[PDB]
Scaffold this active site. Structure first.
Site, PDB file in Angstrom:
ATOM      1  CG  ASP A  35      -1.841   1.222   1.435  1.00 41.37           C
ATOM      2  OD1 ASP A  35      -1.904   2.011   0.306  1.00 41.37           O
ATOM      3  OD2 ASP A  35      -2.650   1.248   2.191  1.00 41.37           O
ATOM      4  CB  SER A 199      -2.428  14.318 -13.385  1.00 40.52           C
ATOM      5  OG  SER A 199      -2.881  14.094 -14.665  1.00 40.52           O
TER       6      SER A 199
END
EC number: 3.4.23.22
Length: 330
Positions: A35, A199
């Site tokens: 994770d 992004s």
């Protein structure tokens, strides 16, 4: 040194991925959920409330000659899906794909929430976010990556998640055969303890690219792609019959649909998520309504590039002095 381990979807939907981890001496092999959105390595164990164990493999520290109780140490964690666990702490030897850390904090669950109990395929989590998020008290503990870093040929690990298929977590090296073209590196903020990046925008299907900054985390421990409501609305508007359902808890769409791809930007580069990656199947057995793999992050408080996005790429988690994230198509 290096490590390389295969990671395997737990079910037909890629709801999560498990990676075998050797703990203790002799080795006890547990299948853990790697994770990058958390920083605790915790396991089902001989200490876990018996009624809260249902099929998982447990770590028994008393059977490990290298296990040592970390005196006074406790841990307690809650995740974004509302699940939680808590317990005490040993140090032990932990190996992943041939890579060995001695004195790794292994957090032994005394309690786990029902979500974990109900998932027989996950024996625990192995956190790969930054150690600043580690919940061990009163002495915060380091992640496996953090402990291994100095010994690694290069201070990196990579995530190569498969779509309905096994993939690979590598430690300490970049497998140049595992991706196509070049790796585009992008800046990371560690300020919130996550592999947080920005992004450069998105496209829906064959649509034009929308340049827009989207701050989010690279999180292998989250199944879906969580993005701002505007983006997600733009995506599902291209699917006939798709709608947000409060009763179901997100966007659903007719199972008879053919989903469009979703592209996200990494600097000047582009990662394309095929439409099929975005289908998470019937909301209930037999239903013709299917759950979307792209969902709104509104009310999460952060955008999450989960497995839906990451499995479309080869992803480099660069833990140099100044960490960065790399993405390649594959």
């Amino acid at each position: 040194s290096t490590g390389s381990a295969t990671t395997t979807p737990i079910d037909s939907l890629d709801d999560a991925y498990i990676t075998p981890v050797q703990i203790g001496t002799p080795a006890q092999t547990l299948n853990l959920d790697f994770d990058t959105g958390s920083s605790d390595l915790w396991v089902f164990s001989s200490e876990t409330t018996a009624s809260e164990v249902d099929g998982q493999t447990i770590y028994t520290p008393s059977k490990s000659t290298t296990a040592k109780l970390l005196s006074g140490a406790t841990w307690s964690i809650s995740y974004g899906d509302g699940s939680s666990s808590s317990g005490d702490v040993y140090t032990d030897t932990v190996s992943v794909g041939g890579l060995t850390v001695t004195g790794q904090a292994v957090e032994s669950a005394k309690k786990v929430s029902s979500s974990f109990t109900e998932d027989s395929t996950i024996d625990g989590l192995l956190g790969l976010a930054f150690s600043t998020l580690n919940t061990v008290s009163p002495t915060q503990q380091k992640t496996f990556f953090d402990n291994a870093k100095a010994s690694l040929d290069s201070p990196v690990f990579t995530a190569d998640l498969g779509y309905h298929a096994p993939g690979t977590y590598n430690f300490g090296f970049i497998d140049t055969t595992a991706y196509t073209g070049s790796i585009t590196y992008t800046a990371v903020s560690t300020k919130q303890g996550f592999w947080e990046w920005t992004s450069t925008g998105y496209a829906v299907g064959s649509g034009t690219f929308k340049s827009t900054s989207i701050d989010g985390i690279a999180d292998t421990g989250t199944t879906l792609l969580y993005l701002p409501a505007t983006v997600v609305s733009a995506y599902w508007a291209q699917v006939s019959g798709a709608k947000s359902s409060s009763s179901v808890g997100g966007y659903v769409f007719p199972c008879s649909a053919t989903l469009p791809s979703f592209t996200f930007g990494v600097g000047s580069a582009r990662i394309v998520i095929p439409g099929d990656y975005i289908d998470f199947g019937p909301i209930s057995t037999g239903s013709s309504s299917c759950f979307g793999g792209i969902q709104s992050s509104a009310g999460i408080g952060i955008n999450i590039f989960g497995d839906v996005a990451l499995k479309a790429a080869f992803v480099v988690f660069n833990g140099a002095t100044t960490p960065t994230l790399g993405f390649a198509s594959k």
